[PDB]
Design an enzyme around this catalytic site. Structure first.
Site, PDB file in Angstrom:
ATOM      1  N   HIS A   1       0.842  -1.193   0.000  1.00 30.97           N
ATOM      2  CA  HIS A   1       0.000   0.000   0.000  1.00 30.97           C
ATOM      3  C   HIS A   1       0.881   1.248   0.000  1.00 30.97           C
ATOM      4  CE1 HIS A   1      -3.821  -2.079   1.796  1.00 30.97           C
ATOM      5  NE2 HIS A   1      -3.424  -2.607   0.654  1.00 30.97           N
TER       6      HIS A   1
ATOM      7  N   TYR B   1      -9.297   5.009   8.086  1.00 32.78           N
ATOM      8  CA  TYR B   1      -9.404   5.250   9.524  1.00 32.78           C
ATOM      9  C   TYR B   1     -10.501   6.299   9.582  1.00 32.78           C
ATOM     10  CZ  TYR B   1      -4.790   3.156  10.400  1.00 32.78           C
ATOM     11  OH  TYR B   1      -3.734   2.290  10.481  1.00 32.78           O
TER      12      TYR B   1
ATOM     13  N   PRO C   1      -3.472  -0.369  19.248  1.00 30.65           N
ATOM     14  CA  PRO C   1      -3.405  -0.766  17.831  1.00 30.65           C
ATOM     15  C   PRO C   1      -3.557   0.297  16.744  1.00 30.65           C
ATOM     16  CG  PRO C   1      -5.443  -1.498  18.815  1.00 30.65           C
ATOM     17  CD  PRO C   1      -4.564  -1.066  19.948  1.00 30.65           C
TER      18      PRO C   1
ATOM     19  N   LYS D   1       1.713  -0.422  15.461  1.00 25.96           N
ATOM     20  CA  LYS D   1       3.091  -0.626  15.907  1.00 25.96           C
ATOM     21  C   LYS D   1       3.479  -1.872  16.710  1.00 25.96           C
ATOM     22  CE  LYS D   1       4.379   2.895  13.624  1.00 25.96           C
ATOM     23  NZ  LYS D   1       4.755   2.576  12.213  1.00 25.96           N
TER      24      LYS D   1
ATOM     25  N   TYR E   1       4.252   6.603  10.067  1.00 21.65           N
ATOM     26  CA  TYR E   1       3.426   5.469   9.660  1.00 21.65           C
ATOM     27  C   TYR E   1       4.192   4.381   8.930  1.00 21.65           C
ATOM     28  CZ  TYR E   1      -0.903   2.943   8.850  1.00 21.65           C
ATOM     29  OH  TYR E   1      -1.868   1.970   8.884  1.00 21.65           O
TER      30      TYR E   1
HETATM   31  C1  LIG Z   1      -5.139  -9.932  22.414  1.00 19.80           C
HETATM   32  C2  LIG Z   1      -4.193  -9.151  21.495  1.00 19.80           C
HETATM   33  C3  LIG Z   1      -4.717  -8.531  20.440  1.00 19.80           C
HETATM   34  C4  LIG Z   1      -3.924  -7.808  19.539  1.00 19.80           C
HETATM   35  N1  LIG Z   1      -4.526  -7.188  18.572  1.00 19.80           N
HETATM   36  C5  LIG Z   1      -3.871  -6.424  17.754  1.00 19.80           C
HETATM   37  C6  LIG Z   1      -4.617  -5.806  16.646  1.00 19.80           C
HETATM   38  O1  LIG Z   1      -5.820  -5.952  16.514  1.00 19.80           O
HETATM   39  N2  LIG Z   1      -3.850  -5.151  15.734  1.00 19.80           N
HETATM   40  C7  LIG Z   1      -2.535  -4.873  15.901  1.00 19.80           C
HETATM   41  O2  LIG Z   1      -1.968  -4.128  15.087  1.00 19.80           O
HETATM   42  N3  LIG Z   1      -1.901  -5.420  17.016  1.00 19.80           N
HETATM   43  C8  LIG Z   1      -2.498  -6.247  17.869  1.00 19.80           C
HETATM   44  N4  LIG Z   1      -1.863  -6.896  18.869  1.00 19.80           N
HETATM   45  C9  LIG Z   1      -0.393  -6.767  19.078  1.00 19.80           C
HETATM   46  C10 LIG Z   1       0.369  -7.773  18.280  1.00 19.80           C
HETATM   47  O3  LIG Z   1      -0.550  -8.837  17.900  1.00 19.80           O
HETATM   48  C11 LIG Z   1       1.460  -8.160  19.261  1.00 19.80           C
HETATM   49  O4  LIG Z   1       2.315  -6.994  19.413  1.00 19.80           O
HETATM   50  C12 LIG Z   1       2.327  -9.323  18.797  1.00 19.80           C
HETATM   51  O5  LIG Z   1       1.553 -10.553  18.852  1.00 19.80           O
HETATM   52  C13 LIG Z   1       3.465  -9.442  19.759  1.00 19.80           C
HETATM   53  O6  LIG Z   1       4.352 -10.452  19.411  1.00 19.80           O
HETATM   54  P1  LIG Z   1       5.082 -11.260  20.583  1.00 19.80           P
HETATM   55  O7  LIG Z   1       5.845 -12.279  19.840  1.00 19.80           O
HETATM   56  O8  LIG Z   1       5.770 -10.304  21.482  1.00 19.80           O
HETATM   57  O9  LIG Z   1       3.947 -11.819  21.506  1.00 19.80           O
HETATM   58  P2  LIG Z   1       2.713 -12.817  21.325  1.00 19.80           P
HETATM   59  O10 LIG Z   1       2.124 -12.884  19.955  1.00 19.80           O
HETATM   60  O11 LIG Z   1       1.812 -12.592  22.476  1.00 19.80           O
HETATM   61  O12 LIG Z   1       3.417 -14.265  21.637  1.00 19.80           O
HETATM   62  C14 LIG Z   1       3.873 -14.585  22.952  1.00 19.80           C
HETATM   63  C15 LIG Z   1       3.900 -16.061  23.036  1.00 19.80           C
HETATM   64  O13 LIG Z   1       4.385 -16.473  24.292  1.00 19.80           O
HETATM   65  C16 LIG Z   1       3.667 -17.623  24.776  1.00 19.80           C
HETATM   66  N5  LIG Z   1       3.782 -17.645  26.232  1.00 19.80           N
HETATM   67  C17 LIG Z   1       3.249 -16.731  27.100  1.00 19.80           C
HETATM   68  N6  LIG Z   1       3.520 -17.014  28.356  1.00 19.80           N
HETATM   69  C18 LIG Z   1       4.348 -18.128  28.315  1.00 19.80           C
HETATM   70  C19 LIG Z   1       5.055 -18.808  29.299  1.00 19.80           C
HETATM   71  N7  LIG Z   1       5.095 -18.436  30.581  1.00 19.80           N
HETATM   72  N8  LIG Z   1       5.745 -19.877  28.911  1.00 19.80           N
HETATM   73  C20 LIG Z   1       5.820 -20.194  27.637  1.00 19.80           C
HETATM   74  N9  LIG Z   1       5.230 -19.627  26.610  1.00 19.80           N
HETATM   75  C21 LIG Z   1       4.527 -18.535  27.025  1.00 19.80           C
HETATM   76  C22 LIG Z   1       2.247 -17.251  24.350  1.00 19.80           C
HETATM   77  O14 LIG Z   1       1.387 -18.432  24.312  1.00 19.80           O
HETATM   78  C23 LIG Z   1       2.518 -16.690  22.991  1.00 19.80           C
HETATM   79  O15 LIG Z   1       2.701 -17.761  22.064  1.00 19.80           O
HETATM   80  C24 LIG Z   1      -2.545  -7.692  19.714  1.00 19.80           C
HETATM   81  C25 LIG Z   1      -1.997  -8.320  20.833  1.00 19.80           C
HETATM   82  C26 LIG Z   1      -2.776  -9.022  21.693  1.00 19.80           C
HETATM   83  C27 LIG Z   1      -2.134  -9.711  22.868  1.00 19.80           C
HETATM   84  O1  LIG Z   2      -5.791  -5.612  11.556  1.00 18.69           O
HETATM   85  C1  LIG Z   2      -5.550  -4.670  10.782  1.00 18.69           C
HETATM   86  O2  LIG Z   2      -5.642  -4.832   9.545  1.00 18.69           O
HETATM   87  C2  LIG Z   2      -5.093  -3.404  11.289  1.00 18.69           C
HETATM   88  C3  LIG Z   2      -4.727  -2.330  10.448  1.00 18.69           C
HETATM   89  C4  LIG Z   2      -4.354  -1.087  10.936  1.00 18.69           C
HETATM   90  C5  LIG Z   2      -4.364  -0.903  12.304  1.00 18.69           C
HETATM   91  O3  LIG Z   2      -4.029   0.265  12.742  1.00 18.69           O
HETATM   92  C6  LIG Z   2      -4.712  -1.906  13.200  1.00 18.69           C
HETATM   93  C7  LIG Z   2      -5.068  -3.154  12.676  1.00 18.69           C
HETATM   94  O4  LIG Z   2      -5.263  -4.040  13.608  1.00 18.69           O
END
Ligand SMILES: Cc1cc2nc3c(=O)[nH]c(=O)nc-3n(C[C@H](O)[C@H](O)[C@H](O)COP(=O)(O)OP(=O)(O)OC[C@H]3O[C@@H](n4cnc5c(N)ncnc54)[C@H](O)[C@@H]3O)c2cc1C
Ligand SMILES: O=C(O)c1ccc(O)cc1O
Ligand SMILES: Cc1cc2nc3c(=O)[nH]c(=O)nc-3n(C[C@H](O)[C@H](O)[C@H](O)COP(=O)(O)OP(=O)(O)OC[C@H]3O[C@@H](n4cnc5c(N)ncnc54)[C@H](O)[C@@H]3O)c2cc1C
Ligand SMILES: O=C(O)c1ccc(O)cc1O
EC number: 1.14.13.2
Lengths: 391, 391
Positions: B72, B201, B293, B297, B385
């Protein structure tokens, strides 16, 4: 007596409008509650946007300013150890600001008016506006103890925040927006050489401080203080010591201090009224809106309202287009809100607020780090600071 | 068992770090509390910065993304009637973002890992970190009912917000900064064609809404909702009706609706911990910080922390420079705060907050008007962005 445009208030708004109109042939009468000396005892502002600089030239009152005013091409923000300079000229595309006291602008305008022979009534008491919605509104007032009446077509309320104009419009017609800050600025004027060739806005953990000037041998300084402080608690000594504690060590050690000529506390506020007119009454300057002094927009917005009013009145008079005066508020309010937004931003990033949690402290610091570090960031500061284009 | 770097958590952070290290010769073992299916059932994010796009290429896992991801060059902000498009490519100086589901990135990484034969222990219960400050720290966990011990040099806590890593560092060493928003996002995934070729948005008086996508026949939509709402109160019907009420009429009438594949409410938060390390434990991703969200980021900061960790570990291992790992937090936190500031800004200008007085409503609207109207303004949005440069 009778005139064409009645002007309430002899501050910069009123005098500037009066000079512009008189120069175009439109007669006006200015009514002022106080004496000329009292008006001339106000220090207040000192930074002018280029647009107002040209309006002064247009009002034909710029000889003295073109001589004594100072053209600045950059300003400085001091935070967490560092001092960052914003190059206003190159970042805004060739624009600059001019430092010339509000007192000077007023003095100059008063001189031009006296010489023109145009009517000015000082010590005009109990001013009252009448028939704001008829074709023939009028103003009554007392001079000595006699109740006089002045007939006019239009009334320009340039009487400031505590003027009678805004109070004369039915409360139900006006929509008010307002923000009061939990702090004020303690300003001090001194006959000493300024510490920097350009201004220094400083964010410090003890609060905001500002290093400004009026001339090569006259400085203006400020320090943020709680609304609970009284000016008599702040001796010159205390001010200097406090100012120095908030500035970069290298700046603090170059500071030439001295006895104060003037000292006072100005509180901070944001206020906008919508609309800025009623019938044949048009508000201008502080009568319609107030901004915190951080962005230096007060005097400058007064000038833009007046520029707009003057040009709509010109058309209505010489070109017989009185329908244009209806769009006065719409035109002015676009600039006003943009200026309120900027003044609010400057104020939130440079001042220390009470009861701020850790997260907001970090965000305020980063706002500075981002805006003072990015080219796009510095540019939003520069174009806003020199002043957005008159529409 | 023994390894070089123990990785807790098999989310994108953990898998990406694990793939980078393995590819460089540094052995690592990933421990995950859940099953692969459970991890793959998370929809979450969908927008990737160019820097992460290149990191994926570097991790050698980009074939599928280079094929299915969408590039995009612009995004749209809808407010008070108008729809403004931000040209990201020209405003950022040639940069763009890529839309490719977080679930896809995870799926791709999991595929690459299984094939590499590198160790991954799913369903690893009761994980505990030991000896974080000695030369030989270790990790214990349960697989089935047996208590195993894994010896390593370093531990990378990539276990998210509710992980065990952050809890393993003495509370007195960590400084926390946090902000909770009074609202959440109700997201909905549908197998329908997206309403726009780019994201929308939208700020509306009923609250924020977001028009996104995952592919040409798969859409992702969100609407701001109070923290008091439960997903079972929101039927598909209600969602579509509500979404439509918040969008521009021309957009709302082009919307192809349909049954939801997934639906959920994600609350909004800002959280940063300082520092991001303790002894031989380094935090990465959500284990160290969470952003609302709005600016997209989360996943992107996870990627930058990991990129930094991977490159400091490379030097320590192959170039014997273990002293460099001390600057991990300093490097990461500069980017983190800049990203938190932007995410916070996006969130405050696009969302409707409860108990907002008239003045702040006006300022929020003007923030949009200024930033979406000024070239310098649009540029601060664009560079932030697409993503600020990796240092
Ligand atoms: C509920 C939720 C919704 C989100 N929604 C959005 C969204 O809509 N849009 C957006 O842009 N961002 C969103 N985010 C943020 C983005 O998805 C996260 O920043 C990203 O998943 C982070 O990556 P990570 O690898 O740090 O953590 P995670 O994806 O959380 O992975 C962490 C992993 O660690 C494992 N784990 C946890 N505790 C333990 C333990 N004690 N022992 C072993 N394994 C463990 C978990 O099962 C998980 O697999 C969301 C995050 C969350 C939590
Ligand atoms: O899920 C998406 O597509 C998405 C896109 C932009 C944004 O800010 C947050 C979001 O979760
Ligand atoms: C106390 C104060 C401090 C300020 N300090 C700063 C500062 O430090 N820096 C900065 O950048 N800006 C400052 N400003 C703002 C800037 O000085 C004002 O924006 C500017 O003076 C406004 O011009 P004006 O012509 O609208 O109003 P004013 O300068 O207020 O003039 C209004 C005039 O109307 C007269 N008047 C009022 N009521 C009546 C009445 N009923 N009948 C007749 N005459 C009446 C008053 O006596 C006054 O002469 C300050 C303003 C104030 C009020
Ligand atoms: O008085 C000044 O010189 C002055 C300068 C800048 C500013 O923001 C506010 C001020 O009152």
């Amino acid at each position: 007596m009778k005139t064409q445009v009645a002007i309430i208030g002899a501050g910069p708004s009123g005098l500037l409008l009066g000079q512009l109109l008189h120069k175009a042939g439109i007669d006006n009468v200015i009514l002022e509650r106080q004496t000329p000396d009292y008006v001339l005892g106000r220090i207040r502002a000192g930074v002018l946007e280029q647009g107002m600089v040209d309006l002064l030239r247009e009002a034909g009152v710029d000889r003295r300013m073109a001589r004594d005013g100072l053209v600045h091409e950059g300003v400085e923000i001091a935070f967490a150890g560092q001092r960052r300079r914003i190059d206003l000229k190159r970042l805004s595309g060739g624009k600059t600001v001019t430092v010339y006291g509000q007192t000077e602008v007023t003095r100059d305008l008063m001189e031009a008016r006296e010489a023109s022979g145009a009517t000015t009534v000082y010590q005009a008491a109990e001013v009252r506006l009448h028939d704001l919605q008829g074709e023939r509104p009028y103003v009554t007032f007392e001079r000595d103890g006699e109740r006089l009446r002045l007939d006019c077509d239009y009334i320009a309320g340039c009487d400031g925040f505590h003027g009678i104009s805004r109070q004369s419009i039915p409360a139900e017609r006006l929509k008010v927006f307002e923000r009061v800050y939990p702090f004020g600025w303690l300003g001090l004027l001194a006959d000493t050489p300024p510490v920097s060739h350009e201004l220094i806005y400083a964010n410090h953990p003890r609060g905001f401080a500002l290093c400004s000037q009026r001339s090569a041998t006259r400085s203006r300084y400020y320090v943020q203080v709680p609304l609970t402080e009284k000016v008599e608690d702040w001796s010159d000594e205390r001010f200097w010591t406090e100012l120095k504690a908030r500035l970069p060590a290298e700046v603090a050690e170059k500071l030439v201090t001295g006895p104060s000529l003037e000292k006072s506390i100005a509180p901070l506020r944001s206020f906008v009224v919508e609309p800025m007119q009623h019938g044949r009454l048009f508000l201008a300057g502080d009568a319609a809106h107030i901004v915190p002094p951080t962005g230096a927009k007060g005097l400058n917005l007064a000038a833009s309202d007046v520029s707009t009013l003057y040009r709509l009145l010109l058309k209505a008079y010489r070109e017989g287009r009185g329908e244009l005066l209806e769009r006065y508020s719409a035109i002015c309010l676009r600039r006003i809100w943009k200026a309120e937004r900027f003044s609010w931003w400057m104020t939130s990033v440079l001042h220390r607020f009470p009861d701020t949690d850790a997260f907001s402290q970090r965000i305020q610091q980063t706002e500075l780090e981002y805006y003072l570090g990015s080219e796009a960031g510095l540019a939003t500061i520069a174009e806003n600071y020199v002043g957005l284009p008159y529409e």
